[PDB]
Subunit: 231 residues, 3 copies
């Protein structure tokens, strides 16, 4: 385990997702409101899944070697298994907040699936130049998601409760900034151009992941917006 310099960030990531999971689980114990239960369910599942996949990376299961550039390159494939489930869940949190129509939810989740799936293919592609073709397609899918979060959702929120509008706005901004960093880290890290070494890359992803999941969740679950308006 300790033979990989990035182990420390995997261990920290595992611990923080674990602690985040336990905290949200305990916090959601005293919740009977059906709307709030949905948000607690979605939001607690996110670090729970991330916990399992961080642990899989820490123990070495979620790592494979991919030959490109005439080298055996360590690729943590478990990230994509995580993101495949957790990024649509995060989008669902946002979509449910603003009472998105079903068509838009399907568009988001579908685009997200394409984003992660093509990122995975890019990560495992042995022809070096083609890795960036997949990166570009995945990034286009991300750009679509970001467009919808801004020019389909933000104007929907203004027509809703002020607490849901303000909470959505914060979470939207957090999401757009944090999510946009991922293709950059991939591009310059071990999966892409290889300018940033894997240990630093792992640190960067860990900071992004904890912020995008536990940070996000802390903001969401402390908000009154997740409760139905009741007396």
């Amino acid at each position: 385990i300790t033979g990989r310099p990035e182990w420390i960030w995997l261990a920290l990531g595992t611990a923080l997702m674990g602690l985040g999971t336990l905290y949200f689980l305990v916090k959601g114990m005293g919740v009977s409101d059906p709307d709030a239960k949905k948000f607690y369910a979605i939001t607690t599942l996110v670090p729970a899944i991330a916990f399992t996949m961080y642990l899989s990376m820490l123990l070495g299961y979620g790592l494979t070697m991919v030959p490109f550039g005439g080298e055996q390159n360590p690729i943590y494939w478990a990230r994509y298994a995580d993101w495949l489930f957790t990024t649509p869940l995060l989008l669902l949190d946002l979509a449910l907040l603003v009472d998105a129509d079903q068509g838009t939810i399907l568009a988001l989740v579908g685009a997200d699936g394409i984003m992660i799936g093509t990122g995975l293919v890019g990560a495992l592609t042995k022809v070096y130049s083609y890795r960036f073709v997949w990166w570009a397609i995945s990034t286009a899918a991300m750009l679509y998601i970001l467009y919808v979060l801004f020019f389909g959702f933000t104007s929907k929120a203004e027509s809703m409760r002020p607490e849901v509008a303000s909470t959505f706005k914060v979470l939207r901004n957090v999401t757009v900034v944090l999510w946009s960093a991922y293709p950059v880290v991939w591009l310059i890290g071990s999966e892409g151009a290889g300018i940033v070494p894997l240990n630093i890359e792992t640190l960067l992803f860990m900071v992004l992941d904890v912020s995008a999941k536990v940070g996000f969740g802390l903001i969401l679950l402390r908000s009154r917006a997740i409760f139905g308006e009741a007396e």
Copy 2:
């Protein structure tokens, strides 16, 4: 096929899931009620999926060799492919019975996914001691599911029709007893401590599977609880 002593239980399992599938399909032919159609759909799909995966194990496709303990260990991975889809379907049957809120359904299905996914990782893990780490996490996810089935669902059922309350109670009890045996069999069988040989392990899983799927389905689909109250 006959070169594996466990083939007989795989063959029997295949036949019983097949027959179970055909029986539920025929039985559901004369059903127009929209609620009953949901239960027939869910409940017929369960042995249909199990049929395909038993057949895959029988024909040898759903088997791989995993090196641990300095041995090549036969691991039937197809079980997890089965359970990944059939256990949430079984939980959906229960959840729909008691008209569970969406948040609770998501919690159940999500926990179930974690249960099966981590069981799969445990099954394929090459570091012997780590297999039991995954077993423990999976078992914790199972315990969460069982907690919800008792302390989130049972009190919901009492507020519903007597036929749905009584049927849920029976199916809940069947589910908790049968499902709890699976981590025990895994732990002592070829995936875990290796005390019980694979042929007996396969027998045990076959008895559990047929009971948890066809047995469960027979109880559910004979009940009046799957029909909306109509005149």
Copy 3:
């Protein structure tokens, strides 16, 4: 890339799915109706997914070699990854058109999953004779889907708006004819009996895919049936 004679059909397929995707995306820009948004979302996702998987086949990622018949046989596994997601989406388009009950939708999607999953197992099976066992099970699942599209849906459509009835009828007929060709092509092509060479097989699948996705989508998205009745 050009080393495989079928590359031309993969390239054409990629281009046509890409163009189809862009066309539906642009066309759906000026849509606010919640019902129409659902259909645009579903129908645009279908060629988008197919685009990615055609590209994966073109670049060689979505190809593996399967030993059977004492030969190394090129099997494009990416087709199943495509179909796993796009065929239920296509069925959802049809089901939503006729306002299918949830039980029937689950039956369709479930049968479809079995159809594609067993086709995949058949495609990767190393025992030649067993490949056709999987083909038969998959074809039985297809026959179930076709039965439901005719003897569960058609009589539902007649009870609905004339525009939805007529559009459903056309799309149903297109779907039944086109989908039925797939098991035939598989059976006689490289996955099955090997009578038709892979380059021609790839052409046939490309024509079917573009017709079943872009052709289908063009018919659906030009129809008034995807809009709620409004003044």
